[PDB]
Symmetry: D2
Subunit: 218 residues, 4 copies
């Protein structure tokens, strides 16, 4: 578990709104789509449209993972960025994400699984809410975005300026796997593209057995 | 005027939507704003916010024009682009425009000195609508966007796909000055940052005494 | 002819060494090559190599100029730049130039033609030197490069720092064609890609009837 | 150690010469220098020159490492790249590297320690040679380059085209510490800037108690 020393201080961050706009906006979501191209051996390019893009590139873990989803119909759920997301200098309206991929066939639920998020602020676990997913195997990114979105709208985790909290992080607890975590704040000088690397491994958890804990300090 | 041939054929332009998205959307408009920085000698950077940018860079004719508006209160009105709009890796969420700058102090009309636009579909002077601005001195770019947004929203000038027309252009007839015209369609393979260079010379005209002529074909 | 007030001052330029490296290094030269691709409608891409590049893109005046040289065997001569020369994100070892393209078939001389350059410094043209070429129809860019290459090495026109001259321009006087000139110095804050735009028109002159004059001041 | 399946096949790589150029040319070496700037919190910018560059930005592991070397007098030994080395988006002549940073104070040797490299080919120990450094603690990058530069020149590990070997990796064996290896070949579609990330950790070994082994297959 994170030691207080290695947690990013939100007050040191210059341009914290750049994170706010990543988690305040809508995520890119598409279902039953298939890769159409590749730039590097570890990414995949989809022909999908959303507001602000008509092409989507996702960067996976390595070439092994990419070629695994290459000819499969998948679902994409991710947090995109547009700056530093080039395809060929001639392809405008492009969007980029890390991971956010899972197989379409056989991964949906007719009735969605609600995960109850245990949020703790300043040591006291004074908050809890449910998040939702209709996927059996869901990426940590989809659940992460959903938690931050709620905390943003309701508890002002992020605002178009400073944040309400100094430090904070989310922790996923898989049943048979090792628990991992993400820091809600980036380094003082950062980039959306570098911060979102936390999604590159494309870690997917079983929505039926996983737990989520959030820890924030004022 | 142009020799009906050198004009650009919409049918040949692949990825026409990219043009459409530039005029179908809202323009960038700010009043009584002052330049705050500069990347190259002929551009000016403003700290203005929009639903996609936190900074706006405007490229002007030459360093002389830029040094002219550098420390003045102006009105900005242009069509911004994002792909290939770089200030530095540490300045994402930036928008770029060409010209679109006018003096603010003394240049407003208590009442919009509306200008009449006479269209001409296939030679036969067909349609004719009304444009309007409350600027004594207004840039051709501002009037050109107003003239295009309309023709789009009501005559399908551009669409999320192809165009109702093959060729087409706008002719600007200033009182005492040579008359210019902008081609409505780009080259088959274009870029938004390259096509918007038609606003780079920051050509401003008198709203009170000037006429616009739009032509088209099918 | 330029007015003294219009010439850019070298003392005002920051990072002038960036121009120095442009004209002190070797130019990119290739003979009898054919365009292998194309990015935008007005450029051409060649699969040619040199130290630092395995691909070369040349930007011409417009699409008419581009489509004219497309399927032809041309000769290339230009001053290349790398920063802001993007091909498709994974096209490392790529170079960019403006124009510098001439037809290959029947445009060469058995014996190189010598062209005298009259170099006037502070109003006194007490210097003359030689420039050579084996092209009948040569580009201004090729002659201009050869001039500055000689002036840099012999007269310290450019150095890895300041220039020995405040101003200076090259004037090309073609036989029965109007003369043109290029300013040796850029605006204070500049980029290599924007300054080299002087060659974009691909202006070519007759090496038999063309004269060159260089005006410098200290 | 890597299971043969784990190693990248060189025959599958498109543009394997982009690797060749990285290790055939001279590295960027600078001793006793101090960082003058910073773009992102995990990088350091140095005002040092070499051919093709006037600025050098080194990307380290995280912000702690960067702040750790920030104001110290360091030595730099790295393998640079230029494509995608975005700095100010108006700063040409920049070279980028990863790590390759060691403290200058109290780290040199009177006599350069020589390290023996054992090269096994197709499983048979077939060649041993010498590499040398004047540093007590040296980056794995420095030694890696030294090893590869020798094997390239003498055994055609890489060439401007294909390589003699199908797979190959280098194994660093420190005294008290776990060993680690670097694959000599990249994924089929790679980028110099992504491939060179094997040096981001800035791992440094003791030049007096470390061994190097190289395994190649044809």
């Amino acid at each position: 578990d994170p030691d207080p020393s290695q947690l990013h201080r939100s007050s040191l961050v210059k341009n914290l709104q750049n994170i706010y706009f990543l988690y305040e906006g809508d995520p890119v979501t598409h279902e039953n789509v298939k890769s159409v191209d590749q730039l590097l051996s570890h990414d995949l390019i989809y022909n999908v449209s959303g507001p602000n893009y008509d092409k989507l590139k996702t960067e996976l873990k390595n070439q092994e993972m990419a070629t695994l989803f290459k000819d499969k119909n998948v679902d994409i759920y991710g947090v995109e960025y547009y700056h530093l997301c080039y395809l060929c200098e001639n392809a405008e309206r492009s969007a980029c994400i890390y991971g956010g991929v899972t197989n379409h066939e056989g991964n949906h639920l007719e009735i969605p699984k609600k995960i109850v998020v245990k949020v703790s602020i300043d040591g006291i676990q004074s908050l809890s809410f449910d998040i939702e997913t209709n996927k059996k195997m869901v990426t940590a990114q989809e659940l992460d975005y959903k938690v931050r979105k709620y905390l943003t709208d309701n508890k002002q985790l992020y605002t178009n300026g400073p944040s309400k909290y100094e430090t904070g992080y989310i922790k996923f607890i898989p049943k048979n796997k090792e628990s991992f975590w993400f820091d809600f704040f980036p380094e003082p000088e950062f980039t959306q593209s570098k911060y979102l690397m936390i999604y590159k491994d494309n870690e997917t958890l079983d929505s039926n057995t996983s737990q989520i804990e959030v820890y924030l300090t004022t």
